[PDB]
Design a protein around this ligand. Structure first.
Ligand SMILES: N[C@@H](CCC(=O)O)C(=O)O
Length: 278
């Protein structure tokens, strides 16, 4: 009963590394494969062996040990965390919905749309929407006038997010103007956004709270500050996604609860998520 499990890279939850040519993953890593295309024309491709580590990987290792299952971990190839595009789910959520994976482990945010098509374990990392700015910049949260009336400033307040995730969904579904203003500043990824902030090319980066709290905690030079958005309606957590009606949610939940109660979760948080910047 080898379980097919999908994941996605997003430090410090999931970190990917090339395997050692001379061909096994060691230390705190585990095997993870990815289907890579031969070219940009056809569907042809081959699965490439890589190695994975991180907070979520350690959670997977513990679940494997405790629930007593073995697994075949693979990386998503189309999309990221999960979005319904042209009426079809992609990313980690898609792999679970279309039964390619029994579970999805990673920095996967629990939200209403996703819960309609997949079942989630209890949350194990708290998150929501946060705002990151250069240390010194003053903002109260997303209700700040700088965000409500960006054009009332010279130059217009510059803020954006990484599209296609739960953060964009929460803005697009409720505040049309803010969303369409923001697309002007879409960021390709977290690292891109951080550079834009520290060099003064971007005023604020709106993104997942867990990741922003982590990044601000160990920024080189501690030049970044993260503050809550105030969008409490968006407060949620990361959860392991399973097939709708999955018979494993019960056992996965019991394990997570066991880890929380025994202090094992506490130890993992200390190992991977602590910060140093005040
Ligand atoms: N963790 C988010 C991705 C990042 C974000 O949109 O804030 C998700 O599962 O969609």
């Amino acid at each position: 009963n080898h379980l097919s499990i999908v994941t996605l890279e997003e430090a410090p939850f999931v970190i990917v590394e090339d395997i050692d040519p001379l061909e096994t993953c060691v230390r705190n890593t585990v095997p993870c494969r990815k289907f890579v295309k031969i070219n940009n024309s056809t569907n042809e491709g081959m699965n490439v062996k890589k190695c994975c580590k991180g907070f979520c990987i350690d959670i997977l290792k513990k679940l494997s040990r405790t629930v007593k299952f073995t697994y075949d971990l693979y990386l998503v190839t189309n999309g990221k965390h999960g979005k319904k595009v042209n009426n079809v789910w992609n990313g980690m959520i898609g792999e679970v919905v279309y039964q390619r994976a029994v579970m999805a482990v990673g920095s996967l945010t629990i939200n209403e749309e996703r819960s309609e098509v997949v079942d989630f374990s209890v949350p194990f990392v708290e998150t929501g929407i946060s705002v990151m700015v250069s240390r010194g910049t003053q903002v109260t949260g997303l209700s700040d006038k700088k965000f409500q009336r960006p054009h009332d400033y010279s130059p217009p307040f510059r803020f954006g997010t990484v599209p296609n995730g739960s953060t964009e969904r929460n803005i697009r579904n409720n505040y049309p103007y803010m969303h369409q203003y923001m697309t002007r500043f879409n960021q390709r990824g977290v690292e891109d956004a951080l550079v834009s902030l520290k060099t003064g090319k971007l005023d604020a980066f709106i993104y997942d709270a867990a990741v922003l709290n982590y990044k601000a905690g160990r920024d080189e030079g501690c030049k970044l500050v993260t503050i809550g958005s105030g969008y409490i309606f968006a407060t949620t957590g990361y959860g392991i996604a399973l097939q709708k009606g999955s018979p494993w949610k019960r056992q996965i939940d019991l394990a997570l609860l066991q880890f929380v109660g025994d202090g094992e979760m506490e130890e993992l948080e200390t190992l991977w998520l602590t910060g140093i910047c005040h």
